[PDB]
Amino acid sequence: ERGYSFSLTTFSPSGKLVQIEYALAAVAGGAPSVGIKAANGVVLATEKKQKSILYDERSVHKVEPITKHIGLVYSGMGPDYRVLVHRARKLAQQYYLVYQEPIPTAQLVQRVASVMQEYTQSGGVRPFGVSLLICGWNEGRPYLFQSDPSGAYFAWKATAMGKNYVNGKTFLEKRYNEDLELEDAIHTAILTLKESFEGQMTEDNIEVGICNEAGFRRLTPTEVKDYLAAIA
Amino acid sequence: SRGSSAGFDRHITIFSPEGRLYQVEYAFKAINQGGLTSVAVRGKDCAVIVTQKKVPDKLLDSSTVTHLFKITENIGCVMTGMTADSRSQVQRARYEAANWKYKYGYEIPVDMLCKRIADISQVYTQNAEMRPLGCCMILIGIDEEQGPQVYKCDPAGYYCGFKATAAGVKQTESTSFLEKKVKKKFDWTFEQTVETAITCLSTVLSIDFKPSEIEVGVVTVENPKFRILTEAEIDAHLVALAE
Amino acid sequence: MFLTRSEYDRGVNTFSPEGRLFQVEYAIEAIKLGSTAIGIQTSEGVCL
Amino acid sequence: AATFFGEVVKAPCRAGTEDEEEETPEDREVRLQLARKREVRLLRRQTKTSLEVSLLEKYPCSKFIIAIGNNAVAFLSSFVMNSGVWEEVGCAKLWNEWCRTTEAFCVFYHLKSNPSVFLCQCSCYVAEDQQYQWLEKVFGSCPRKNMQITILTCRHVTDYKTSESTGSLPSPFLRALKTQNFKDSACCPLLEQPNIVHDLPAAVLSYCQVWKIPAILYLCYTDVMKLDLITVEAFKPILSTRSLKGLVKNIPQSTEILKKLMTTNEIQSNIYT
Amino acid sequence: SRRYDSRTTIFSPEGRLYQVEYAMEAIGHAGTCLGILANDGVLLAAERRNIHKLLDEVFFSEKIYKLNEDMACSVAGITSDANVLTNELRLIAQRYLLQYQEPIPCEQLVTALCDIKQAYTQFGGKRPFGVSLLYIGWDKHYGFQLYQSDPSGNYGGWKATCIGNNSAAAVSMLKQDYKEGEMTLKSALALAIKVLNKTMDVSKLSAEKVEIATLTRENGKTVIRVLKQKEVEQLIKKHEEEEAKAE
Amino acid sequence: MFRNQYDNDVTVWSPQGRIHQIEYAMEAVKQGSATVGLKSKTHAVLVALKRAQSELAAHQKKILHVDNHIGISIAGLTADARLLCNFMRQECLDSRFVFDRPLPVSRLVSLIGSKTQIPTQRYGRRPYGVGLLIAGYDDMGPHIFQTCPSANYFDCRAMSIGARSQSARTYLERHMSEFMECNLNELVKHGLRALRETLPAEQDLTTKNVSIGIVGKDLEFTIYDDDDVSPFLEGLEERP
Amino acid sequence: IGTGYDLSASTFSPDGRVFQVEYAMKAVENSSTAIGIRCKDGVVFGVEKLVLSKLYEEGSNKRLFNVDRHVGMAVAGLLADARSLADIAREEASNFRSNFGYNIPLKHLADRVAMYVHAYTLYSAVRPFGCSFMLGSYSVNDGAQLYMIDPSGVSYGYWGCAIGKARQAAKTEIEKLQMKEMTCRDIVKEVAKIIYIVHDEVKDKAFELELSWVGELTNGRHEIVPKDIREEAEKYAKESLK
Amino acid sequence: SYDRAITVFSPDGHLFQVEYAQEAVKKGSTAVGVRGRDIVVLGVEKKSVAKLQDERTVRKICALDDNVCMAFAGLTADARIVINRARVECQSHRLTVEDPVTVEYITRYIASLKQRYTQSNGRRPFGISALIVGFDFDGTPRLYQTDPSGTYHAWKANAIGRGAKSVREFLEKNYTDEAIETDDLTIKLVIKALLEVVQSGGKNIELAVMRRDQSLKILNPEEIEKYVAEIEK
Amino acid sequence: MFVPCGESAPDLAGFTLLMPAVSVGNVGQLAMDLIISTLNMSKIGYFYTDCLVPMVGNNPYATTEGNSTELSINAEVYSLPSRKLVALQLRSIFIKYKSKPFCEKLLSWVKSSGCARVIVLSSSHSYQRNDLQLRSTPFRYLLTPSMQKSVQNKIKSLNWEEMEKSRCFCIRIPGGGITKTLYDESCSKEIQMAVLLKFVSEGDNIPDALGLVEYLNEWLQILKPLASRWKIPSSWRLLFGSGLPPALF
């Protein structure tokens, strides 16, 4: 019944919260993004909404770094993404100041999820309509996490989200290996992004970022073009 | 607060079953209420803003009717939409720029100003007491290492940097015309930028312009201060275009 | 020429079309559920 | 109304559908008991027994006069029924939120010299779900061919629909509404169009119009709805009609009685100064 | 009915709190948890819900948490609220230790958390937590203990209980298979395996579907450990052999 | 028929640009009893009509005291009248303490209007349902002011408010040209004759239902009740 | 048609309109007409002031305020809001003079008051103002200036303005004047004549003309017109009516 | 209609939310309290017993101080807050006045605390009712009752909770000066009163007995069975 | 029951019955007023029942001085024998538990008299629409399975939109009043019936009534297909109340 679909702080007679489901539906209607954890690195790929010649390449990016070893990509709303990125950077700096060592990935994910949970329990606000993918590298061991609008986080090995993500998930299930490398993971990420793409992919309409023991790096358009030409 | 209206359409903090906010889209629709159009073009060493000027009455004072503002000594602006909301946002932008200068010891960059305005504007979307402002802001300026810069922000809180943008009723046609021009060629001088900016509006609205029906503001590398052109210079440009 | 429903007696700060506060009237009516009390004032004293 | 910040509220509806759209034995028993609590009973106060037959079925009637409200019953008591012998026949018992006990009464009289003339002094309030029971218990099922009915009531002046302001009208004033079969003519202008009247007098007029009985209703729009002398003096022109011509005998003594009873009014709550 | 469901601060004509009832109904979808008290230890077994092929195993455990040197807990409901409640429990225990230089008793910790849970069902504008808890621990006043809490803010001590999906059948079987005063740790483990096998109708049990925690007292110290897949496989194999011998 | 949505709060405009709650609050003034206030070249006079709940209760008082040179009369609610009277007294006291001078009536009434305008714009409030008549004396001479629930005030020469005050207003308008020359006597009589037009034609004015307040050039504000009113009532005619 | 989206000041219609502000602007047309004309060397105001009853004094409930030593003001709509806005304008002028030690320019004062008015059309805890007003001033180094502010919060400079019930006919009458080449003494009569022409006597029993200027004659001060000049202007207007 | 807000009056002058809150008291376990001359007895019946539970953590009789006790019927989670606040106030009163607290004083504090939550729309009342017994400083036994609306008044013997009308009628019929002669007689009277609703005594009954100048004492199943047998004899 | 206004009730064999429903905004009632005023139908009787709050007023469709004074009640029946049409008008609101009995009595009268079809005009709440219903026309319709095949053929030719169904499938019409009960009872008793409705909100509801009348006319063809089309009754004045108080503005 529609009597419980309007207010955030109301339980359905079946014990359900509906506005959070609607926020998840908002998340599932954005641009696709893919994350794959290889044996010695993590790769993040996504589409971009500009897809035009009037856009300036130096203005706004979707894959952003938090620390020397942490980066993330989103799927959903962008204005809600910027504030969370700023808060994550501030939390990482606070941790470094107190403990004099870089923050582990798990702690950062926990604190960000705790921040996001607060907006789903009080009347007068709305939940965040965004979902996050966080990659890191600590003690010589890669990590990959995903955080929901509810404030719940999972640890993944390969995932997809955004438009047409069930087919992406089953594609990844069909062609994922536990003993992969970074180049193979990049090729698989490009292929699973191409699966849901509609136009002609170039180096100007996707973003790729990787994370290995050296640090978190965002690939330049020339490198993306070279990788795209490799698989044809 | 006197409560929140019930419906998938009548409040800012209520998600639709398909997961979309409709008050933000209605705020977007509120931009076209004025009936004017704006075009911004970035050149090799200059940036130009062109907009319409409608004076319906004859008892009005045409000197007090304008849409080009000035944020700092080296940043211009142009607003589209509701007049009072535009003026209020202009005042807020001036305050933010002054505060940044005081706190950091040097002039605020265009992208930083746009990001600050967008971050402030996003908060109105997540609270039940406040409502979005029905206007969009376009800024121009010159960076130190980089050349000219053109930026735009919208009521939803999303901002981006462009090469040639437009806003208003004829946004789609202006965008198509500018896309064709940019794809053809982009190396432009000061004279070419103003000419193409005027030509876009002229060919989209199908109007032969007059010197008192438009207003132009430019920023150049030689003189990095915002300057508003006069009727004589606008007429000279129009005559050169016609010839 | 239709008959409709109008409500003015569910708020403390609402005025009826004839300038009547109905919540105060209802609070006064709430007295009639108590017990009877009588007071007589006389030049020699007071009785309760 | 919102009780906390950001509460979701719904607009009220003027068609009243927002309550009955929602349609255990304990609930049925509760509903039956509540319905039994507010039924209409007509009984004779002489022996405290109910009349199993409709009041007008026992006694033939030729004239029926009904007064509703304090001002109307005061006017009838002072001017009409101070010059004759009237016997009480029955009374009605009601319960609702606005009439806890039955100042609140509904008593019927009939003239001793002429048993075909009746009266009714209703000062209580009959709810919207008790008016049809009232009509059934007073008039019955089969009406009479030859019978004339007159009704009197009072309404506040702010309920009048007019283009000008309400305060500019010279209150009090009289208005009339009569059925098709009423051959005579009223002594006051008929009610304007966009104005309507509801509740019990409307029920009586609807009954009389449907069943082809002559009737007339007199309304007084006044700015003082309490017991006031001007409001009850505003009813004087009615005495010139054929419905009340043979019932008034002494005007000065009725005025004296009215003045005497004006000094024993009920205590008003000290809300206004 | 549908008139007294808007918020938590409305009483039904017969004195009922429908919002709290719906919040308690929200617990019936989560996984199944168990707790059995023995003479020389206490037990806590849970069902794993995250079983997707592409998930990872990075954490110490999925549903079992450690609050203190002497206590542990298990959650069932909304993960977001469970995290907040767990953090608050840890803070409360540390505060008591700092104040008194002694570990906090289990009943005191449970009462302190239940007061916080009850505070959200009284002030309007907030939403109650949809989480239930199971606590185990050791105390110098009463020894081994086992408690349970629900979103209403109520709690009570048990000897064998169950929360989550298919709780009624598990409680019914425990009430007839638990014998007071004569339970050892091995008997408790066997009973837990049998009850989980009966209440999980999805498929046959496997060592990767359940996690078992054991709290025992060894030489003036309390040791909490999580059984490994080897031990779980041996337990399941022994139970299956016993069932086969039964027929 | 279409008004049901836009007449429940003071923060909502009707589609015709009207605030219906202010107009509803303005109707509470007509729930009181009649009051008459007039002035002459030297004095200012207030006359009020008192009602009683029953024969065994004292009549409610209508004329209050604000300062040595200002007095007010009440018609409407009672709590609002008490609150406004407290505000008036506090302002007069503060002004006298600080400046050692009486507070001008114009400034006082401006303060009243400024304070009363606020609850007609914000949520969670209701307008004041009371109307006042103010009589004072300062360097500019006598003054008569009228206050409205809509935060509006007027500067009058003779005014009447309350229930059925149209007759009093008509009499005052007819006899307006003789007020500026009368002394205290015949001025109180003009006021009483104006107040007598609000009664039914059968009954008259006794000493238990009239109150008089007078302030003048060298006479402070005084209230005459009960037996103190007989000298003013001696000379009245037999209601012509 | 905006039914369902017109109960709060923070709600957008499906075509991007706020209807409470529109209703507030509609509310201004319930009052009499006030006009203001800017001329070569000054600004003159004129208000058609209705009479409610003969029991009121001559100067009761005026509609022309003195905001500062050099600024006048004329209002239309709800009166209480007009008093509140006059108080706000006085406070702003006083604050500027105290801070910076010289008379506030008219454009700055107009901007301040317009922004204050606009701030009320953003929140659901208050309601928009229901009055319009005009400001006029003169100085030797700037010259005459005239502005209008409406309930939405939009201000503009004018050569001749009119607000109230009958602004259309008043504007039509004003548009036939060469106000750029005349003098205040020649504009008072025109203002009175326009006010008399616009007034309707069928629905309005009687009225009193109210006038005031500011300019070089008054040496940069806002003052009430002397009585003799008012009488002469009224006589000329009555003669021109015939 | 008029039964959805705490601070809204019915057209006949009724506050329905408080009555609905009181309706929740009439569903809890029955509680009985009888005042003697040198003893006070409280009795609560167990609504149901689960074999796999610890009876220590489900008790409904609490001690507020050395000379005050308490028994409730209603919402269990709501009772705990009131009990803790009352304990803190009892200890804080001695810090200001050397004398121990009085039964009327603590009942007044509890009633005021209960009334504080029926004054606004932002919070709901407490759905409990309590019986308070104890001894005064000079040695006078007392017994009081409190309601969710915030009213208190003294008694000689009372019963609250479900099935309380029958127990109150029985106490009215069987209360006399020769029935409270001794502690055993008083305890047997309380047991007899509770036996009218309990289906089988001994297993569904708990008693707390307090004597003068002594602490609270909770009887055990052995003693309860002994008294039941003596009554049945 | 139907009480004739004269001596003997007329015959309604093969007639079409038009009735409103007491719904949100009174859109059906306003549409019925417009239809009765335009077609100039004459009263033939009343419909006396104890299910509606009584009300009385003069003639709401007055056009001259002679007929401007004629009493009216809360339920009246008009007819136009030339076009074989009959209309019912309700000017009040329902009592608590008197909706289903009224529907039963009305349907029994319809079956007994000998009418052919029934058409019902109502409305629904506009804030309960999902995303798909925010993009479409605000007009919907329903039909009963016993309706003549020509009717569905014509409706399909008209390119209209049918009301969507929900699962408990069942028909749910929020704010429709007695529309759902009428539809279900008509399906039970096998009576031809059609329902037309609009998504409206409470306020000024004149344009909604005009639009609904035009929507009906596209099918029934009352007027020629295409301001002066419909005659506004004289009663549609002072809808917002009385005039302004003097000393406010």
Q: Tell me the C-alpha distance between H26 and G241, whole Å.
A: 86
Among candidates C6, C13, C19 on the partner chain, residue whose Cβ is nearest the Cβ of F31: C19
Q: What type of residue sits at position D176?
A: A
CATH for B116 = 3.60.20.10
Are B81 and B67 in contact by the 8 Å Cβ rule? The answer is: no
Are A108 and A143 in contact by the 8 Å Cβ rule? The answer is: no
Q: Tell me the C-alpha distance between F227 and F211, whole Å.
A: 11
Number of other residues whose CB lies within 10 A of the CB of residue I7: 5
Number of other residues whose CB lies within 10 A of the CB of residue B179: 15
Secondary structure of residue F192 in the 3-state scheme: helix
Which residues touch B154 (CB under 8 Å, ≥6 apart)? Answer: B28, B136
Cα-to-chain-centroid distance, residue A118: 20
Tokens of G36: 């203001």
For the beta sheet containing G71-77, the strands, ordered from the edge strand earlier in sequence to the opposite edge, are G64-66, G71-77, G131-137, G145-149, G155-157
I25: nearest CA partner in chain C? C4
Q: What type of residue sits at position F87?
A: F
Whether residue G124 lies within 8 A of chain F, CB to CB, comes out as yes
What would you report as the CA-atom Rg of chain D, rounded to the nearest whole angstrom? 21
Q: Tell me the C-alpha distance between D147 and D60, whole Å.
A: 9
Q: Tell me the C-alpha distance between D232 and D259, whole Å.
A: 11
Tokens of B98: 């002054």
CATH for A141 = 3.60.20.10
Q: Tell me the C-alpha distance between F69 and F89, whole Å.
A: 12
Number of other residues whose CB lies within 10 A of the CB of residue E224: 20
Are I97 and I22 in contact by the 8 Å Cβ rule? The answer is: no
Q: Tell me the C-alpha distance between I53 and E57, whole Å.
A: 70
Tokens of F130: 């009371």
Number of other residues whose CB lies within 10 A of the CB of residue I129: 19
The full DSSP string for D217-254 is EEEEEES--SS-HHHHHTTGGGGGSTTSTTS---HHHH
Domains along chain G?
Answer: 1-240 (3.60.20.10)
Which residues touch F193 (CB under 8 Å, ≥6 apart)? Answer: F171, F236
In this structure, what are the phi and psi dihedrals at residue B74, rounded to the nearest 5 degrees? -130, 20
Are F74 and F64 in contact by the 8 Å Cβ rule? The answer is: yes
User: Entry resolution in angstroms?
Assistant: 2.9
Are A29 and B159 in contact by the 8 Å Cβ rule? The answer is: no
Q: Tell me the C-alpha distance between A211 and E135, whole Å.
A: 41
- Beta bridge partners of residue I119, listed in sequence order: I18, I194
Which chain E residues have a beta carbon less than 8 Å from that of D4? 7, 124-125
Secondary structure of residue B13 in the 3-state scheme: coil
H runs (alpha helix) in chain C: 22-29
Q: How far is I52 from chain G (nearest CA, A)?
A: 28
Q: What type of residue sits at position I240?
A: F
CA neighbor of B65 nearest in space, from B49, B75, B76, B51: B51
Strands (E), chain B: 4-5, 37-42, 46-52, 68-72, 75-81, 135-142, 148-153, 159-162, 164-168, 214-220, 227-228
Q: Are strands B214-220 and B46-52 parallel, antiparallel or unpaired?
A: antiparallel
For the beta sheet containing F44-49, the strands, ordered from the edge strand earlier in sequence to the opposite edge, are F158-161, F35-39, F44-49, F210-215, F222-224
H runs (alpha helix) in chain D: 17-20, 25-37, 55-58, 70-79, 131-139, 200-210, 229-233, 251-262
Are H37 and H210 in contact by the 8 Å Cβ rule? The answer is: no
- Longest Cα separation, chain D: 71
Q: Are strands D106-111 and D86-93 parallel, antiparallel or unpaired?
A: antiparallel
Contact E58 A106 (CB under 8 A): yes
Give the N- to C-terminal CA distance of chain F in Å, as an integer: 47
Which residues touch A135 (CB under 8 Å, ≥6 apart)? Answer: A35, A37, A42, A44, A70, A71, A72, A105, A142, A143, A144, A145, A211, A216
Angle at which helices B171-184 and B190-205 pack, to 10 degrees? 140
Number of other residues whose CB lies within 10 A of the CB of residue E217: 15
- Cβ-in-10-Å burial (0-12, 13-18, 19+) of B233 comes to middle
CA neighbor of D156 nearest in space, from D222, D84, D64: D222
- Cβ-in-10-Å burial (0-12, 13-18, 19+) of A217 comes to middle
- Beta bridge partners of residue F70, listed in sequence order: F67, F136
Q: Tell me the C-alpha distance between G219 and G41, whole Å.
A: 11
- What SS3 string covers H2-37? CCCCCCCCCCCCCCHHHHHHHHCHHHCCCEEEEECC
Cα-to-chain-centroid distance, residue G148: 7
Q: Tell me the C-alpha distance between G177 and D28, whole Å.
A: 82
Angle at which helices B110-123 and B83-104 pack, to 10 degrees? 120
Cα-to-chain-centroid distance, residue F173: 18
Whose tokens are 């050296």? That residue is: A214
Contact D269 C17 (CB under 8 A): no
Q: Tell me the C-alpha distance between E236 and E242, whole Å.
A: 10
**Enclosing H/E stretch for F39:** strand F35-39
Whether residue G60 lies within 8 A of chain F, CB to CB, comes out as yes
Strands (E), chain A: 33-37, 42-47, 64-67, 70-76, 130-137, 142-147, 153-155, 158-161, 206-212, 215-218
CATH fold, domain E1-247, is Glutamine Phosphoribosylpyrophosphate, subunit 1, domain 1 (3.60.20)
Cα-to-chain-centroid distance, residue D101: 17
Are E51 and E209 in contact by the 8 Å Cβ rule? The answer is: yes
Which residues touch D225 (CB under 8 Å, ≥6 apart)? Answer: D154, D156
Q: How far is B16 from chain I (nearest CA, A)?
A: 7
The full DSSP string for F46-68 is EEEE---SSTTSPPPP-EEEEET
Q: Tell me the C-alpha distance between A141 and A158, whole Å.
A: 16
Secondary structure of residue G139 in the 3-state scheme: coil
H runs (alpha helix) in chain H: 16-23, 76-96, 103-115, 164-174, 183-194, 221-232
Q: Tell me the C-alpha distance between I187 and I185, whole Å.
A: 5
- Beta bridge partners of residue I124, listed in sequence order: I199
Angle at which helices D131-139 and D200-210 pack, to 10 degrees? 50
- Range(s) of the domain holding residue B13: 1-243
Tokens of H181: 């002669």
Give the N- to C-terminal CA distance of chain G in Å, as an integer: 45
Are F10 and F126 in contact by the 8 Å Cβ rule? The answer is: yes
**Enclosing H/E stretch for D9:** strand D8-9
Q: Tell me the C-alpha distance between A26 and A130, whole Å.
A: 8
In this structure, what are the phi and psi dihedrals at residue B137, rounded to the nearest 5 degrees? -120, 135
Which chain I residues have a beta carbon less than 8 Å from that of C2? 26, 29, 91-92
Number of other residues whose CB lies within 10 A of the CB of residue F53: 15
Residues in chain C: 48
- Beta bridge partners of residue F72, listed in sequence order: F64, F134
The full DSSP string for B73-115 is TTEEEEEEE-HHHHHHHHHHHHHHHHHHHHHHSSPPPHHHHHH
Q: Tell me the C-alpha distance between H87 and H63, whole Å.
A: 8
**Secondary structure percentages of chain I, helix, strand, coil, to 5:** 30, 25, 50
Is the peptide bond between D172 and the residue preceding it cis, with omega within 30 degrees of 0? Answer: yes
Which residues touch B127 (CB under 8 Å, ≥6 apart)? Answer: A124, A125, B12, B13
Q: Tell me the C-alpha distance between H10 and B40, whole Å.
A: 65
Residues in chain I: 249
Q: Tell me the C-alpha distance between A61 and A73, whole Å.
A: 10
Can chain G be said to touch chain A, i.e. do they have 3 or more Cβ pairs within 8 angstroms? no
**Interface with E, mutate which of H1, H14, H55, H80 (most E CBs under 10 A):** H80
Which chain B residues have a beta carbon less than 8 Å from that of F123? 1-2
Are I18 and I35 in contact by the 8 Å Cβ rule? The answer is: yes
**Enclosing H/E stretch for I206:** helix I206-220
The Cβ-side half-sphere exposure at F221, using a 13 Å CA radius, reads 19
- Longest Cα separation, chain F: 58
Which chain B residues have a beta carbon less than 8 Å from that of D11? 5
Q: Where are the domains of chain E?
A: 1-247
Please calculate the CA angle I106-I107-I108 and round it to the nearest 5 degrees.
90
Q: Give the C-alpha distances (Å, rounded to integers) separating D269 from B19, F53, I37.
A: 56, 8, 49
Q: Quote the number of domains for chain A.
A: 1
Q: Are strands D8-9 and B4-5 parallel, antiparallel or unpaired?
A: parallel
Secondary structure letter of residue E104 according to DSSP = P
Are E158 and H52 in contact by the 8 Å Cβ rule? The answer is: yes
Can chain A be said to touch chain F, i.e. do they have 3 or more Cβ pairs within 8 angstroms? no
Which chain E residues have a beta carbon less than 8 Å from that of A121? 126-127
Which residues touch E29 (CB under 8 Å, ≥6 apart)? Answer: A15, E165
CA neighbor of D216 nearest in space, from D195, D193, D186: D186
Q: Give the C-alpha distances (Å, rounded to integers) separating B180 from B161, B186, B196, B242.
A: 19, 10, 12, 21
Q: Tell me the C-alpha distance between H96 and H91, whole Å.
A: 10
Among candidates F55, F163, F202 on the partner chain, residue whose Cβ is nearest the Cβ of D224: F163
Q: Tell me the C-alpha distance between C26 and C38, whole Å.
A: 23
Are D225 and D154 in contact by the 8 Å Cβ rule? The answer is: yes
CA neighbor of H18 nearest in space, from H108, H117, H104, H88: H117
Secondary structure of residue G143 in the 3-state scheme: coil
Are G53 and F173 in contact by the 8 Å Cβ rule? The answer is: yes
Whose tokens are 């960059």? That residue is: B109
Cα-to-chain-centroid distance, residue I117: 14
Whose tokens are 């617990």? That residue is: E27
Secondary structure of residue G205 in the 3-state scheme: coil
CA neighbor of G213 nearest in space, from G238, G239, G182: G182
Contact C18 D158 (CB under 8 A): yes
**Cα torsion I208, I210, I211, I213: sign:** positive
In this structure, what are the phi and psi dihedrals at residue D121, rounded to the nearest 5 degrees? -120, 90
Q: Quote the number of domains for chain B.
A: 1
For the beta sheet containing B148-153, the strands, ordered from the edge strand earlier in sequence to the opposite edge, are B68-72, B75-81, B135-142, B148-153, B159-162
Contacts 24+ apart (CB under 8 A), H111-115: H111/H146, H111/H150, H111/H151, H111/H152, H112/H150, H113/H82, H113/H85, H114/H82, H114/H146, H114/H147, H114/H148, H114/H149, H114/H150, H115/H149, H115/H150
F27: nearest CA partner in chain I? I245
Secondary structure letter of residue B150 according to DSSP = E
CATH fold, domain H1-233, is Glutamine Phosphoribosylpyrophosphate, subunit 1, domain 1 (3.60.20)
- Cβ-in-10-Å burial (0-12, 13-18, 19+) of I17 comes to buried
Contact A124 D8 (CB under 8 A): no
H runs (alpha helix) in A65-215: 79-99, 105-117, 165-174, 182-196
Number of other residues whose CB lies within 10 A of the CB of residue G42: 23
- Beta bridge partners of residue B70, listed in sequence order: B76
- Beta bridge partners of residue G210, listed in sequence order: G47
Residues in chain D: 273
Tokens of E215: 């709290």
